[PDB]
Amino acid sequence: HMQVTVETLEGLQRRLNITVPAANIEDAVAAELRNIAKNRRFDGFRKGKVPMKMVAKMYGKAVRQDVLGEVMQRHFIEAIVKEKINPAGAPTFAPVEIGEGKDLVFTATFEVYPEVELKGLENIAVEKPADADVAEMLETLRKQQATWKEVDEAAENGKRVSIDFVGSIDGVEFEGGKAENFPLEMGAGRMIPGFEDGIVGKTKGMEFVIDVTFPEDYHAENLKGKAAKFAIKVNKVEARELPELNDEFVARFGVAEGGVDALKAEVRKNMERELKQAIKARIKEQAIEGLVKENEIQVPSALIDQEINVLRQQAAQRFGGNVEAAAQLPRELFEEQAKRRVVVGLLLGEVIRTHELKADEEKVKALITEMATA
């Protein structure tokens, strides 16, 4: 097996230290020499069987440069994959140990894509688990076209419960423990355990106190493991009624891809409103202690794929149009960049759509690439 170690450097600069079993290089160099001997006519000898010693003195080095170049690349890609690292540039190889008969050791220095989440957009967009194509999207369009409506029901998984709450320890209200019209989506696990798990069953108008202890891994210093009380008031309980998934719900879009795009245009349009909302809420949900997960929008896999296909194209360019190499890279490598791409696109798209701003699709896309890949 081949070995690799990853080093982080200044900036988005990483270095890979790959080692390759000597056998690989040595076996291949031998073979090719045997080939050259068998298929090259040398002055003074008949095709095939010529002093091996001779062919080695004429192509020994040369063949080693090629076997070497092939081995580095093949293992650079294999490392990248195994190390789940998405290069944002071409790698610069360096020979550490290329001695004949000895294990191959070389370095692969290069740049990667930044990891820091976008300001105010940290983990704001996510992909469903894993429905297997234009199905999950019809569903996404279904939920986006869904409307929340009040119901005389109680708070249970699925329902959205608007609540007001003010936390306190010994009758003393700590900072950021008071929230009005907070929308708690039962089942979303967005609050410190014990919270939600004690509002379930309550209906509109009820006021009550729940005891909740903050987790050890809790961020706030002054609340870490403190026992607390939250005075809750349930403002209302809504249910989401999803429209039907019938034929007239899909005839609105054209035929073939034109249709499969008219629909993507629509899903995108809604995500523009959903992200705007998600962001506003994020503001209002800052400082609100008890929260242990920021809100988020769900992006159909079909839409993340469109971005991953772009990332692959770009990766192929940075590898000299080596398309097969780009295909070999597993999807999860670009998953992150894709999400950043989708969000920046929705950000810009919302401004453009709202004021009917006319801008060349190509320029916008260039900027999205720049802003997303930061």
Residue (6 or 251) nearer to its own copies, CB: 251
Scan for tokens 């290089």, then name that residue: 25
CB 130 within 8 A of CB 301: yes
> What would the x/- binding string for its own copies be over residues 98 to 117, using CB under 8 A?
x-------x-----------
Residue (203 or 306) nearer to its own copies, CB: 306
Range 114-133, binding its own copies (CB under 8 A): 131-133
254 in contact with its own copies (CB under 8 A): yes
30 in contact with its own copies (CB under 8 A): no
Q: Positive or negative, the Cα torsion across 289, 291, 292, 296?
A: negative
157 in contact with its own copies (CB under 8 A): no
Q: What's the CA gap between 363 and 210, in Å, rounded?
A: 53
Q: What's the CA gap between 167 and 289, in Å, rounded?
A: 9
CB 278 within 8 A of CB 296: yes
Residue 232's CB is within 10 A of a number of other CB atoms, namely 22
Residue (63 or 237) nearer to its own copies, CB: 63
351 in contact with its own copies (CB under 8 A): no
Residue (44 or 205) nearer to its own copies, CB: 44
Scan for tokens 């000898």, then name that residue: 45
Selected binder of its own copies within 170, 217, 221, 247 (CB under 8 A): 247
156 in contact with its own copies (CB under 8 A): no
Question: What does the radius of gyration of the chain's CA atoms come to, in whole angstroms?
Answer: 29
111: exposed, middle or buried (C-beta count within 10 Å: 0-12, 13-18, 19+)?
Answer: middle
Query: Least distance to its own copies from the beta carbon of 67, Å?
Result: 8
Strands 160-168 and 297-299: unpaired
> Could you list the residues that contact its own copies (CB under 8 A)?
32, 35-36, 39-40, 57-63, 65-70, 72-73, 93, 95, 98, 106, 131-135, 138, 245-247, 250-251, 253-260, 306, 309-314, 316-317, 320-324, 326-327
